């Protein structure tokens, strides 16, 4: 069964774009999020994510704008990734539907 995941204290360490296989109207924007404090070989340090950006609409989606911001500043963010899977370098990546920056250790365990 697929179920929606909620991850706390994740920092985006990579950004990527690639065409969408099913339809050429959309294109996927991917990334890699690493959990703070996770072991180097733990799966939590290599979590891949992607989301679809519509190409009929020129400009930038809201998700891209803040993703570019946190990637540059390396800020933590709570990531509501799930449940669908999108291909990313031939490897599964959880689709991201909502992502919010952290406010402190009180709300980000």
């Amino acid at each position: 069964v697929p179920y929606v995941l909620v991850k706390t204290n994740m920092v985006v360490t990579s950004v990527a774009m690639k065409p969408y296989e099913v339809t050429p109207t959309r294109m996927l924007v991917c990334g890699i999020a690493a959990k703070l404090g996770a072991a180097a070989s733990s799966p939590d340090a290599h979590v891949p994510f992607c989301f679809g950006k519509d190409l009929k609409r020129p400009g930038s989606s809201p998700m891209e704008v803040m993703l570019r911001a946190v990637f540059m500043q390396q800020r933590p963010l709570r990531m509501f990734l799930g449940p669908k899977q999108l291909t990313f370098e031939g490897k599964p990546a959880l689709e991201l539907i909502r992502m919010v920056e952290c406010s402190g250790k009180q709300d980000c365990p």
Partner: antibody
């Protein structure tokens, strides 16, 4: 749980092939399916995976573009469409059913892993 | 891109001795993403022990797993004559389903 692995592999390198998996007792509509090749030299290697409804379909690095997977849950079958095969495609192709993951991957979700447990007799493909 | 190496090349043990089969991983995978197979010569592999601390269905109790880390072992208590096969360890903690080399145990 029986799988027949119909079809046979003798095809010149520029040709195409289309294998079939056919279950016998277990219904195919609610289980993930894998294809695994067994090279006598390089050992067992993973080919492709497919989800229950067909949403997620991931292949291997070497067969990323040439191979294709598909299902027909009405007729209880699983197919693998094969494009131009090089010399490295010569292996014995099996059918594997991951028990408790109707999606392709369970390691992403942090779910526990149950490994396959259903395999077919195998079909031999040579180029 | 994780390579599993089985350092036992080939064993020939007595029908009552204990066999230990080491599976070394490139990275420190978790224990819940492991499995062990058995391939008798002439048929497709069957799962022996998935999630090494747990067994599969229709298998004797002589098979046991090991702990997590980078090294894992499969223990067979009493090598009955029927246990002459090639044994593998697979992985699923990353996207490519990578299998082991294959340790052949013959009696």
């Amino acid at each position: 749980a029986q799988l027949v692995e119909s079809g046979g592999g003798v095809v010149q390198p520029g040709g195409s092939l289309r294998l079939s998996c056919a279950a016998s007792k277990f219904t195919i509509s609610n289980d993930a399916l894998h294809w695994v090749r067994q090279t006598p030299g390089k050992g067992l290697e993973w080919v492709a995976v497919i989800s229950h409804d067909g949403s997620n379909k991931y292949y291997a690095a070497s067969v990323r573009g040439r191979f294709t997977v598909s299902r027909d849950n009405s007729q209880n079958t699983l197919y693998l469409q094969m494009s131009s095969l090089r010399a490295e495609d010569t292996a014995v192709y099996y059918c594997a059913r991951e028990p408790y993951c109707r999606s392709t991957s369970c390691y992403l979700y942090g779910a526990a892993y149950y490994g396959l447990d259903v395999w077919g007799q195998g079909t031999t493909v040579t180029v | 891109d994780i390579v599993l190496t089985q350092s036992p090349g080939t064993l020939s043990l007595s029908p009552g001795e204990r066999a230990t089969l080491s599976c070394r991983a490139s990275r420190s995978l978790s224990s819940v993403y492991l499995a062990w197979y058995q391939q008798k010569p002439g048929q497709a592999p069957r799962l022996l022990i998935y999630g090494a601390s747990s067994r599969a269905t229709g298998i004797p109790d002589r098979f046991s797993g090991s702990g997590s880390g980078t090294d894992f072992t499969l223990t067979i208590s009493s090598l009955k004559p029927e246990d002459s096969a090639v044994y593998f360890c697979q992985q699923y903690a990353d996207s490519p389903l990578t299998f082991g080399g294959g340790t052949k145990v013959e009696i």
